[PDB]
RNA sequence: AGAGGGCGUGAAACCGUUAAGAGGUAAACGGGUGGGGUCCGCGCAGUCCGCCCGGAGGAUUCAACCCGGCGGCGGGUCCGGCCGUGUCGGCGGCCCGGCGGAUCUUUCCCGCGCGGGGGACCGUCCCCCGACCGGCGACCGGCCGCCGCCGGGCGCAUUUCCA
RNA sequence: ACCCACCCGACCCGUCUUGAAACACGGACCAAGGAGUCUAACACGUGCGCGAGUCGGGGGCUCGCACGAAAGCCGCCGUGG
RNA sequence: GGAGCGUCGGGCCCAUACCCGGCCGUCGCCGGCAGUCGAGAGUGGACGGGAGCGGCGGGGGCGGCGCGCGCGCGCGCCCGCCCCCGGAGCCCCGCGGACGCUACGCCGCGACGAGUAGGAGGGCCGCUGCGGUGAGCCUUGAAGCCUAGGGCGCGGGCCCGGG
């Protein structure tokens, strides 16, 4: 009875440890691979342009797939259509951010809420900072902090997303499974902008903070995140 | 004033009914009184049926 | 049954005593004075109770038979232990553990015994 | 129990749950069923359709005992009799069929609702419905009128 | 600030039964435990139904139980009813059953045992089959109470067949202006 | 060398001053005893700046130290001796208070029993 | 009489005085500190106790071990007998087992086709023993094992006590 | 928690009102009293009992009622609703 | 030579808004706990013959389903064992189970919290009287009254000291 069971229990324990080791290595190589991918992406946009500039030519790069959207004004006295859109983007509180994948449909929605948001095309860094510093998964409807992969895997593992790095990869690349990984990220509760704003009430182009500021959302993200 | 569905009902408390309320706190003492009377008649009509005819 | 009469008694018993945000229970053979299911002398088929001895010295353990409750005159069986503290506790410990009698109480019964024993000695300055 | 009623909770609150704009005035509608035709008209004519107006024949010195005619359905006709009539029958082997006097048990008419079990019966009653008759015949029985 | 309606945040469903009877509370205690610890959803339905009101757990007749168990397949199976089993006087031949119910009326109890049936309390059902395996869970008809004839689209509203509340039915209690076409109109 | 409690945590109170009633300062007919004001125009009931504060459940005490005396015990109003032997198995966490109505001869009896049982009495030196 | 003839208790508004503190934006109020008072807890070191351990001092008696008694627990062999659930056998209580029935019989009896009582019948409740099974907190008796208490023995590398 | 000081805040409550610190009304001060009740009828919700039934009255039988003008029972148990 | 007006910089100031943290409550979790293994769980266990370093010689997949803390192993001596928790000594224990379990109890995670009229819930909030109950309290002093005394409660209020 006794030693046979004991040994069986010790065997199980090892088999587990082996599995965890194997998963850990997988993760490690996926991260290595995404490092190499991002390196290639960054270089090849330069590569292209340089080759266009060699000829009397231009390289118009890809219109951006994904944007970060920060609600920059409050919850009083807000139009009904605007209010609906804001709560379809998951922007209830002021200074909540979300990733949003761009497309004819989504862009027209961002336009209907322009004076209520600031938004633009986030960096890789920006995506990393957001997810690591302020990444909380919607797990059984409970906002829960992403302290270990076990959480992400538990919810997203059916999509080949098994660690924080994979999550970042899916959000940044806007992969097949973007919607699902993005919805799993609870909306980003950023603080107030350190260094203040320019002007909440007006559009960026005319001095303000509202509307699309494309590249320059990254500066805003650092001062809030 | 009626409010959204009910029995359109007509209580008969428009006369001075509280002048003519008949309470029943007697009834016990009444029942006892009747039963005492009944027992007396039985004793009077000695071997006759208490019932009556 | 046990649980049925607990449902009857849980809030109403004469032995119960509320007041001042606590609740308590004065029913005999309830060590820990609690209005609990676990700790309630009257309800259970098997019961422990650790009172002090009437002598002034020692403790009495009070173990319930099972033979026949219905007959409260015979139900509880008492036993004085007038021994050197450590042994007194071991006597009660065995009684509960090695008999397999209400092992829920085991340690609570020991603590009570301990508090009784503390209570009966030269007091202070 | 006043203890459990509402007015105990309303102590303190000024209007006592009747609002301070419009108050609890005495009789704002009119007393009772006032305004059925004017001003409470909608209530009366979407919850009591048919209240107003006459209909049918008067009948002066009605007495209910004349028209007394309680009914029993075939559904539960055998319930009138003790089970051992229904049992000693589906047995016996004479093709007897027991009698069910319906008037004895306090019904005058025998109406036709329900399945009757395949088991002959003589049913004595004051009146029958057409279908109630037909069912008994099909079971293998006989209706019997009685005064 | 955050915009959420706090209007329908609190769900209104029952948690425990409102009744104070001790035996029903013991059953609840039993079935809570079985509901959470097992994977059976039978235990979860039974629990939910133990909390509900008298109205809300109506009486199942004998005849309706018979016919539901008559159905092809559920043979040699225990019928379960959180309400009461009553007689049907207008059913005669009663098969031999297995029945769980909080109550069974005396006449119905006689009828079922005479036929060679068995009657179980809910504690007995738990010891027999903790995960509700091999059970037909039934209920009496919820919409039986007269009450529901008065609900719906109000009477005096076209194509509504809703019993109006009336002190006494007869020739001259309603059935004039608003029912006869000959008097004003009809719906 | 009095009876220590089992654990003596830092009791922290959110507010110490009594909530007092509106205009209880202005009148002798109005008592300090709190009432929520239900006036239509009322500085206080509509939470203006620089007014008396209204008690909410926000000011509630931390469950660990609620009803905890400064000593670290909670009271329990003992009335007679038999009612002390309840506390026997707590004594580290609750303390007997002997009642006002209890006579001077049997206050003495309660106190000595408590001392034997090591139950802390919160008003022992008093009647005499 | 700090109960004095409209006198038990003796609140508030209001007033007198005594004590303390303040005082040119009427007072009063909320928040925050500070100053002063009133008492209350201390300490004439508060270094607070509780386990276990090590040491050095004193202290009586036992734990361990058996022996004799008592009591309790639990156990199966259900061993023996009481106890009761479901089933089967006795048709055995059935008339020495009663009620109920629109089941029957007026072969009966009594009273006047009906009432009462028998007599069949059906439903329901009780005896006899055997068998199987849930052996069920429904109990006894022996046997076993364990625990506890008392009383014997065990004189001191054990045994508790005390500082 | 008694008093005093200082900084900051701070208009008087109740009320009708779209709007009250209002040049809107009530209010010198304190005590005690002081306003959603009971009956009937309906409705829906909920709890309990019984369930094709259910029912209790009214009456009757059991006590001088200490507690009783209760409690209990009734081929009245169902005339009847 | 702005403390004005128009255009613009840096820097700083503070809301009950935003972020992090504490604490109170409410809501939600098919939430957890009546006593058990187990953290992307992706089995466990008889039992029979045949055998053994064998294994299940499947993707630059970057991997999840299979591998390097053992499967067989050290001991008794190629054969036997691979044994029992009243004792493995325990990070898991399926033999028995809280310090915890007033199951109307206890415990854990999230989220949220303006409010007139109005609605609902909970009040170990409060008053007077009745059935029960506290071997309650009380001339060794009840009720009431007063208190720059000590405390509890978010609060309604309450408890203690002195008079
Ligand atoms: Mg605005
Ligand atoms: Mg007469
Ligand atoms: Mg209000
Ligand atoms: Mg209202
Ligand atoms: Mg008003
Ligand atoms: Mg009105
Ligand atoms: Mg108006
Ligand atoms: Mg709200
Ligand atoms: Mg709601
Ligand atoms: Mg206003
Ligand atoms: Mg006097
Ligand atoms: Mg007097
Ligand atoms: Mg006087
Ligand atoms: Mg004075
Ligand atoms: Mg002076
Ligand atoms: Mg005003
Ligand atoms: Mg003016
Ligand atoms: Mg006016
Ligand atoms: Mg005036
Ligand atoms: Mg008053
Ligand atoms: Mg109802
Ligand atoms: Mg609120």
């Amino acid at each position: 009875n006794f030693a046979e069971l004991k040994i069986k229990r010790l065997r199980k324990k090892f088999a587990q440890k082996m599995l965890r080791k194997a998963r850990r290595k997988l993760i490690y190589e996926k991260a290595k691979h995404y490092h190499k991918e991002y390196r290639q992406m960054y270089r090849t946009e330069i590569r292209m342009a340089r080759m266009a500039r060699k000829a009397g030519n231009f390289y118009v790069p890809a219109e951006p797939k994904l944007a970060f959207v920060i609600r920059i004004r409050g919850i009083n006295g807000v139009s009904p259509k605007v209010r609906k859109v804001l709560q379809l983007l998951r922007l209830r509180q002021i200074f909540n951010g979300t990733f949003v994948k761009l497309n004819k449909a989504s862009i027209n929605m961002l336009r209907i809420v322009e004076p209520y948001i600031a938004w633009g095309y986030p960096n890789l860094k920006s995506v990393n900072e957001l997810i690591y510093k302020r990444g909380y998964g919607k797990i059984n409807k409970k906002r829960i902090a992403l302290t270990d992969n076990a959480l992400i895997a538990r919810s997203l593992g059916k999509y080949g997303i098994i660690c924080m790095e994979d999550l970042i990869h899916e959000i940044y690349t806007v992969g097949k499974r973007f919607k699902e990984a993005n919805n799993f990220l609870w909306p980003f509760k950023l603080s107030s902008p350190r260094g203040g704003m320019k002007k909440k009430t007006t559009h960026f182009v005319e001095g303000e903070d509202a509307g699309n500021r494309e590249d320059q959302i990254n500066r805003l993200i650092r001062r809030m995140n | 004033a009626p409010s959204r569905n009910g029995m359109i009902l007509k209580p008969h408390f428009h006369k001075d009914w509280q002048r003519r309320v008949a309470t029943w706190f007697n009834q016990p003492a009444r029942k006892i009184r009747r039963r005492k009377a009944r027992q007396a008649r039985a004793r009077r009509i000695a071997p006759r049926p208490a019932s009556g005819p | 049954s046990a649980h049925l009469q607990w449902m009857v008694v849980r809030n109403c018993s004469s032995f119960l005593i509320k007041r001042n945000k606590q609740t308590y229970s004065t029913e005999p053979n309830n060590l820990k004075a609690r209005n609990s299911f676990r700790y309630n002398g009257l309800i259970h088929r098997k019961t422990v109770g650790v009172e002090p001895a009437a002598d002034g010295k020692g403790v009495v353990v009070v173990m319930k038979r099972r033979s026949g409750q219905r007959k409260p005159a015979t139900s509880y069986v008492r036993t004085t232990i007038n021994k050197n503290a450590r042994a007194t506790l071991s006597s009660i410990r065995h009684m509960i553990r090695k008999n397999k009698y209400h092992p829920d109480l085991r340690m609570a019964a020991i603590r009570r015994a301990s508090a009784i024993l503390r209570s009966q000695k030269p007091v202070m300055v | 129990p006043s203890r459990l009623r509402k007015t105990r909770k309303l102590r303190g609150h000024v209007s006592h749950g009747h609002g301070r704009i419009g108050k609890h005035r005495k009789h704002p509608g009119g007393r009772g069923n006032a305004g059925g035709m004017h001003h409470h008209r909608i209530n009366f004519d979407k919850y009591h359709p048919g209240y107003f107006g006459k209909v049918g024949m008067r009948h002066y010195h009605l007495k209910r005992n004349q028209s007394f005619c309680p009914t029993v359905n075939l559904d539960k006709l055998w319930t009138l009799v003790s089970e051992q009539t229904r049992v000693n029958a589906a047995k016996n082997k004479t093709g007897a069929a027991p009698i069910i006097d319906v008037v004895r048990s306090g019904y005058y008419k025998v109406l036709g609702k329900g399945k009757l079990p395949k088991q002959p019966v003589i049913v004595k009653a004051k009146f029958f419905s057409r279908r109630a008759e037909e069912k008994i015949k099909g079971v293998g029985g006989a209706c019997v009128l009685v005064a | 600030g955050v915009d959420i309606r706090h209007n329908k945040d609190r769900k209104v469903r029952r948690k425990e039964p409102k009744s104070q009877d001790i035996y029903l509370r013991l059953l609840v205690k039993l079935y809570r435990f079985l509901a959470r610890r097992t994977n059976s959803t039978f235990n979860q339905v039974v629990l939910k139904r133990l909390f509900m009101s008298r109205t809300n757990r109506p009486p199942l007749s004998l005849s309706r139980m018979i016919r539901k168990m008559k159905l092809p397949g559920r043979e040699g199976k225990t019928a379960v009813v959180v309400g009461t089993i009553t007689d049907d006087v207008r059913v005669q031949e009663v098969p031999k059953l297995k029945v769980c119910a909080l109550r069974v009326s005396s006449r119905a109890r006689s009828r079922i045992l005479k036929a060679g049936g068995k009657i179980l309390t809910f504690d007995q059902l738990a010891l027999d089959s903790p995960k509700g395996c091999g059970t037909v869970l039934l209920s009496g008809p919820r919409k039986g109470r007269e009450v529901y004839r008065h609900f719906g689209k109000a009477p005096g509203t076209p194509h509504s067949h809703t019993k109006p509340y009336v002190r006494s039915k007869g020739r001259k209690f309603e059935r004039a202006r608003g029912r006869r076409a000959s008097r004003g109109y009809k719906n | 060398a009095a009876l220590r409690p089992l654990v003596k945590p830092k009791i922290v109170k959110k507010r110490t001053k009594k909530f007092i009633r509106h205009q209880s300062d202005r009148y002798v007919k109005i008592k300090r005893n709190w009432r929520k004001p239900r006036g239509i125009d009322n500085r206080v009931r509509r939470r203006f700046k620089g007014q008396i504060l209204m008690p909410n459940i926000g000011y509630g005490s931390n469950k660990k130290t609620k009803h905890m005396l400064p000593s670290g015990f909670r009271k329990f109003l003992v009335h007679n001796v038999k009612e002390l032997e309840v506390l026997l198995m707590c004594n580290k966490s609750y303390c007997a208070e002997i009642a006002h109505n209890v006579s001077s001869k049997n206050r003495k009896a309660i106190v000595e029993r408590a001392a034997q049982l090591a139950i802390r009495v919160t008003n022992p030196n008093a009647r005499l």
Side-chain angles (χ1 to χ4, degrees), chain F residues 8-71:
Chain F
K8 215 289 175 58
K10 191 77 80 273
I11 299 111
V12 61
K13 307 210 168 294
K14 300 213 179 110
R15 182 197 160 79
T16 49
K17 291 184 194 160
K18 295 278 282 253
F19 288 94
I20 85 302
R21 206 248 254 222
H22 184 49
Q23 317 213 122
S24 59
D25 55 313
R26 277 160 166 272
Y27 297 75
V28 188
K29 76 212 222 312
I30 305 296
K31 287 103 144 60
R32 283 188 180 177
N33 290 346
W34 176 252
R35 299 288 128 107
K36 174 168 281 275
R38 295 149 202 288
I40 68 185
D41 312 309
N42 205 63
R43 290 231 293 277
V44 177
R45 134 279 176 292
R46 60 158 152 194
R47 248 107 91 266
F48 279 161
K49 188 169 134 193
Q51 306 311 307
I52 73 194
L53 294 87
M54 262 160 28
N56 322 290
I57 197 60
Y59 296 99
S61 293
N62 176 33
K63 258 103 71 248
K64 295 233 192 89
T65 60
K66 198 200 210 85
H67 303 303
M68 194 169 279
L69 304 201
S71 55

Side-chain angles (χ1 to χ4, degrees), chain A residues 66-91:
Chain A
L66 139 282
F68 193 66
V69 180
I70 298 161
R71 200 202 225 221
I72 57 160
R73 71 152 50 159
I75 200 32
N76 338 56
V78 53
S79 167
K81 193 150 61 157
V82 168
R83 178 164 58 198
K84 219 279 177 284
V85 168
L86 280 159
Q87 72 194 1
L88 297 182
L89 302 179
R90 313 205 254 82
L91 299 178

Side-chain angles (χ1 to χ4, degrees), chain A residues 75 83 87 92-93, chain E residues 1-5:
Chain A
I75 200 32
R83 178 164 58 198
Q87 72 194 1
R92 293 175 177 273
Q93 265 192 329
Chain E
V2 210
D3 65 301
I4 320 92
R5 292 201 80 176

Side-chain angles (χ1 to χ4, degrees), chain D residues 53-99:
Chain D
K54 263 174 274 186
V55 61
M57 297 190 280
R58 256 129 75 259
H59 185 245
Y60 290 127
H61 169 47
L62 183 136
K63 31 206 170 181
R64 288 279 161 73
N65 301 303
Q66 288 183 309
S67 81
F68 183 73
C69 190
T71 74
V72 70
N73 298 351
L74 295 173
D75 214 22
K76 55 243 185 63
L77 193 73
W78 283 103
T79 55
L80 300 178
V81 210
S82 56
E83 44 57 81
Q84 72 177 310
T85 51
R86 203 226 70 181
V87 175
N88 297 19
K91 213 201 287 188
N92 196 31
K93 213 173 181 181
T94 318
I99 286 157

Side-chain angles (χ1 to χ4, degrees), chain C residues 51-91:
Chain C
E51 314 183 36
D55 303 341
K57 306 305 304 307
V59 129
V60 305
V61 185
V62 169
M63 298 258 321
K64 195 177 194 171
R65 291 222 268 180
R66 93 88 162 269
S67 192
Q69 56 264 78
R70 275 330 78 73
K71 304 186 211 197
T74 78
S75 189
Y76 297 113
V77 45
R78 315 188 71 174
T79 161
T80 308
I81 312 176
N82 209 141
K83 306 179 78 183
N84 57 332
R86 210 174 302 218
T88 311
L89 269 47
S90 295
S91 310

Side-chain angles (χ1 to χ4, degrees), chain E residues 143-157:
Chain E
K143 232 76 162 192
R145 302 214 323 288
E146 185 163 324
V147 154
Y148 291 93
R149 291 158 185 166
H150 300 300
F151 300 167
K153 202 192 199 205
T157 322

Side-chain angles (χ1 to χ4, degrees), chain D residues 18-29:
Chain D
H18 286 275
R20 69 213 305 173
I21 299 86
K23 292 126 177 175
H24 190 233
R25 289 276 157 78
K26 305 204 74 167
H27 292 261

